[PDB]
Structures are given as structure tokens and as C-alpha cells.
RNA sequence: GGGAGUAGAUAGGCGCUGGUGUGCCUCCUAGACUUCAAAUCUACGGUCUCGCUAUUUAAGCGAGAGGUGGGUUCGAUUCCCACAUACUCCCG
């Protein structure tokens, strides 16, 4: 057995075998990784052959020369796909970010007075105008936005929240787990499905420093279910002199009904003009911008949050800040169609079929392809609109040779990789999320997998 | 079929709490239980006014003064006055 | 593909039973009865395999297999469990 391993060549030897074949650096790395996988597989006695070695070492190299993170063509039809990187960015924004990152910028520098300045100052002007709030602020993400508001205003004091709003969004986020780490004391009122106003007003006391409500973004409850209206909570706060904090989460910057889509999703401007003292939300959801925790509300509160020594550990990076300002500039100019997430959901039903069939026209030739276009009702919103169900045209496909399962798998291994839905052994492609320049990339991928 | 069987037992006296075998009082809950253990497969059974109280009784019987673990998504409010959190407290 | 429900013979379709399996229908054959048909009636009947005699075969005899394995039991076709497989329904 100590001879079934002595066999395996030397890294000096393999590097030779790939003189100009591949960079020496990448060769040695793949040889090491490979050399280790063979020493262990032989020590546990699971390998009797070593011929696979040469072929494999070259595969690592081909792989290792390719970065782990890679752009992926989303065909699922889910605009806010938490898994695929939520809201993608308009090129207008990508270029403004590109420019500010290429070199130095006035990030923390005020050109007027020639002395350092707050980097959060560039944007805030935009927020207070769009929301109507007295002051604003932004941090890494909404997760931290919550965390910061709690440790800032309710460390050691009670915060009332509905028992139906103690959510678990994402894999590691849970209102109850973080608020605990927040230093705030959690007072849950009402019941899962129902919660009246009496429940809120009933748990108030000397320690109650905050009235908080979370928006059920990634789930919903139907059947006997009751919720406390927002106007009521504001009224309740102003009666006892207690602040109100709404975690919208979706981060919808404007009224959604104005675009044809009828939903009750809450938005900053309206929520603020309602009497809410503070409101937060992610920038990479319904806002359509880069990841960012956004907070807007009363000035005296914003100032309290900013001064928090923790705000410095959440303060946003140079990339998302810039990219955020250009996404905000678009909103002032009413350039709605320029932000991907917005355009994808408000696309004409007509619009969708138009792309549904222009793709089917590209696959009629490819061998063994059973191409059909169906009109189905799916749910566009992934991380912000749970209930929304909007019609969209999917081009359902099916090959005689391979099975739908095997199909999705090779497609995710393609370059670029394509992710799509599976329903009853039939691959589907929702056009709600597909960019036009992908249609050509789709056809070239399929003909390269079925005919090779 | 049921409405008539009820109609009959209510028209007059019955062996509600009386075991005809031994001629002495007996548990009225004894008539049914035979059915339940057979259909469910449980070791023993019992029945009370309604399920609201069924819960209430199991809790005060086995967990008065001690902790009971339950999912935060299952603290329901069924009906107008029933709420797992309000009754378990009581 | 992931779940779940339904499931299974020792001639073949449907149903049941902790007493060493059994009821209805069918096929077959066999027999009986018939002018004929029909009807009817009857069957510790039937597969496979292995070992034994006969040995073309039959024919007889003995044993076992209920998807596979295991367990409980005095006794498992029933019950339980595990795996596999078939039919159907929910989800990606």
C-alpha cells in the first residue's frame, strides 16, 4: 500500500508536463490539490488506479483559472431572487460606480470647505426629498439597519412587537435572535394569525421605549388573520409619547399602484406621511439599487442613531454609496424603466410574449427540441412581494434524449450558466427576468450541449 | 340517525351514569371510550365539553407551574375568545 | 428529481382472515348429466423448484417458496420493521 502511493508523480514532474500548457502557478496549485486527493483516497484504500490523475490535474487548472463567482442567466422569472443576487443594476449606474472607483473621489471630502466631510452627506439630500422624512441615514444592509435602531433607542428597555411579525428572513436573520443581540428587551403581543390594537396598548409601561412593526415580506398568512393598522400605531405612540419604527424591508420607494400593479406593499413616502417616526428597508429589493440599509424619520432620532459608535461598523462602502446615489438620481428624474427590478415587473404582458416567441424562433432548428410557449401565473417577487402573482409567458421545452433533471444540471454548468424552473419533467423559462442579449446566449448554449 | 338516538335517550331516563351490570353508579365517559381507543389506537381516552377546554385541561393537568415548549408560529387565535397564549396562562 | 398515499400469492381478475389461510368471478381441465344446446353440478385440482423412483413423458412421492430479509409469537398470508419494485397524488 506504501507503493500504491509512491507511484503518484512529483509536482516538478507535472509542471513539466504542462510547459506552456498552462501558467506554472496554476499548474502547481492544481497538482497540490490533486496530489492531496490521491494521498487520502489511497490511504483510506478507495483508489487502485492513478490514470485519472493526468486528466484531472488539467481539469483543476481549467477550473481554477476561472473565478468562483460568475454571472448567471436567470430564467426562473423571479425578479427579487435572494439566491441569485437580488436587484441587478442598470448600466447607467454601473458606469457611475465604475468611474468613482477607478480613482480617488470626494467620498469623505467636502470640496467646498476643503476639510473632511461625512460620506453619508451626499445621498441623504435625495432621501429626505423622496421620503419626506426630517433626516435620513444608511448602513450596510437592512439587517443591520434594524440592529442599529434597536441598540440605539432600546438597549435595556422594552420594545413591543406583534407575535405574527417575528420573522425569519434569509438563513441567519430572525427578529428575535438579533434584537436579543441588540440589547433590547422583546415584548411580543397578540397571537400568530391575529393581533388587535389592544394587544399593543396593553403591554406598554415604564420600560417601553419602542413600538416596532415588521412587514411580512417573504411570507403571508391567510384564513382567520388580523393585523393592526399603521394609523392606529401612530395614534398609540403619540398618546403615550412613544416612537414608532417600521421595518418595511421591501424598501419600496414609491406608490406601486401608479404603475398598474395593484398591491398594498408599503412605501417610505406614504409610511412617513402617515406619522411613523422611523422607517427602514433594503436597497437591493424593491428599490432596485445596491445592498443598503435605509433609514428615514424624525431628525432627533436620526441624530441619535448616527452618533451610535456601532454606525461606523455598518457605514457603507464606496461602491454601494455611489451606486446608490445614481439609483436615487434616476428616481428624481422619473427614470423608472432604467432600474431593472422595476422594468421587469411592470413589463407589458404583450411585452413578455414578444420575447417568449422570439426565443422559440431561435430553437426550432436545434435537434430533438420540443418547443412550446405557455401562459402561466407565477409570483415575481422573491424577497419583497410574497403574495403578488402576475401572468408571464414561459417557453417550456423538452428533448427526447435527455431528461429535464439532467437538463437543468448541465445548464448550470454552462458558461454562462443558466438557471430555470422545473415543473413536471418540463424545463421552463420565464421571460420576466431574461435580458435580450441573453436570448442569443441561450441558443448558443443549447446547441452546444445537445449536439456535442 | 344520530338526532333520533339522542332524541330517545333524552325522552326519559337512561343508564348515563349507571352500569346495568353491577347495579351501582358508573362513569358516563365509559360508554364511548371503547370506541375511541379502537379507532385511534390510543391506550386510553377521555372527552370533555370542547377542545378549548381539552387543551386547558391537559395543560393544567401536566404542566401547571412547569414549562411547555411550543412553536412561535403555532400560538393561534381561533374563534373570538380563544388564544393559546391567553388560556395556557390561565 | 423530493414527499406522500395505495400495494404485492404459491394457475389468473376482485375481497377478507393471528388458528398453520379463506370467499366471490374467471380460465383450464377433469368428470357427471344431458338428442342438442343450454343450464347444472363437482374439484384437501392446477405454478415453480429441488431431491427421489419410473423415467420420452407421465406417473407417484417428499419438501418449500406469499417481492427480499428480519422480528414478535405457541402459531405470521395477516402484525411490525427494513429494502426494493409497481400504480397514483403534492411540491422544484
Swiss-Prot record, chain B:
Location of this chain's protein in the cell: Cytoplasm
Domain of life, source organism: Bacteria
Family: Belongs to the SelA family.
Task of the protein: Converts seryl-tRNA(Sec) to selenocysteinyl-tRNA(Sec) required for selenoprotein biosynthesis.
Descriptive protein name: L-seryl-tRNA(Sec) selenium transferase
Gene that this polypeptide is encoded by: selA
Amino acid at each position: 500500500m506504501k507503493s500504491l502511493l509512491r507511484q503518484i508523480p512529483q509536482i516538478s514532474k507535472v509542471v513539466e508536463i504542462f510547459a506552456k500548457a498552462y501558467p506554472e502557478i496554476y499548474v502547481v496549485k492544481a497538482a497540490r490539490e490533486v496530489a492531496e486527493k490521491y494521498r487520502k483516497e489511497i490511504i483510506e484504500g478507495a483508489r487502485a488506479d492513478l490514470n485519472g490523475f493526468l486528466e484531472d490535474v488539467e481539469r483543476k487548472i481549467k477550473s481554477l483559472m476561472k473565478p468562483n463567482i460568475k454571472r448567471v442567466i436567470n430564467a426562473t422569472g423571479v425578479v427579487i431572487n435572494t439566491n441569485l443576487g437580488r436587484a441587478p443594476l442598470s448600466k447607467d449606474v454601473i458606469n457611475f460606480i465604475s468611474e468613482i472607483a477607478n480613482g480617488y473621489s470626494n467620498l469623505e471630502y467636502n470640496l467646498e470647505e476643503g476639510k473632511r466631510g461625512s460620506r453619508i452627506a451626499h445621498i441623504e439630500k435625495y432621501l429626505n426629498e423622496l421620503t419626506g422624512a426630517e433626516s435620513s441615514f444608511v448602513v450596510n444592509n437592512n439587517a443591520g439597519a434594524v440592529f442599529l435602531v434597536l441598540n440605539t433607542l432600546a438597549e435595556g428597555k422594552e420594545v413591543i412587537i406583534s407575535r405574527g411579525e417575528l420573522v425569519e428572513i434569509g438563513g441567519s436573520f430572525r427578529i428575535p435572535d438579533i434584537m436579543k443581540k441588540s440589547g433590547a428587551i422583546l415584548r411580543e403581543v397578540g397571537t400568530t394569525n391575529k393581533t388587535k390594537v389592544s394587544d399593543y396598548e396593553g403591554a406598554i409601561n415604564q420600560n417601553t421605549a419602542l413600538l416596532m412593526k415588521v412587514h411580512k415580506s417573504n411570507f403571508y398568512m391567510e384564513g382567520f388573520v388580523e393585523e393592526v393598522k399603521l394609523e392606529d400605531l401612530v395614534k398609540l405612540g403619540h398618546k403615550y409619547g412613544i416612537p414608532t419604527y417600521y421595518d418595511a424591508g421591501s424598501g419600496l420607494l414609491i406608490n406601486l399602484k401608479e404603475f398598474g400593479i395593484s398591491v398594498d406593499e408599503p412605501n417610505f413616502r406614504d409610511c412617513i406621511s402617515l406619522g411613523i417616526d422611523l422607517v427602514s428597508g433594503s436597497g437591493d429589493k424593491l428599490l432596485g439599487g445596491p445592498q443598503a440599509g435605509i433609514i428615514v424619520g424624525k431628525k432627533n432620532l436620526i441624530e441619535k442613531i448616527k452618533k451610535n459608535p456601532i454606525a461606523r461598523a455598518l457605514r457603507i462602502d464606496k461602491l454601494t454609496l455611489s451606486g446608490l446615489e445614481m439609483t436615487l438620481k434616476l428616481y428624481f428624474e422619473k427614470r423608472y424603466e432604467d432600474i431593472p427590478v422595476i422594468r421587469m415587473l411592470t413589463q407589458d404582458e404583450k411585452a413578455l410574449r414578444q420575447k417568449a416567441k422570439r426565443l422559440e424562433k431561435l430553437l426550432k432548428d436545434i435537434p430533438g427540441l420540443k418547443i412550446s410557449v405557455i401562459k402561466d401565473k407565477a409570483k415575481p417577487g422573491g424577497g419583497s412581494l410574497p403574495e403578488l402573482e402576475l401572468p408571464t409567458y414561459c417557453v417550456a421545452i423538452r428533448h427526447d434524449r435527455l431528461s429535464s433533471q439532467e437538463l437543468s444540471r448541465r445548464l448550470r454548468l454552462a458558461e454562462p450558466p443558466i438557471v430555470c424552473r422545473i415543473r413536471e419533467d418540463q424545463l421552463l423559462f420565464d421571460m420576466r427576468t431574461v435580458f435580450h442579449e441573453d436570448l442569443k446566449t441561450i441558443k448558443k448554449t443549447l446547441q452546444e450541449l445537445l449536439s456535442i
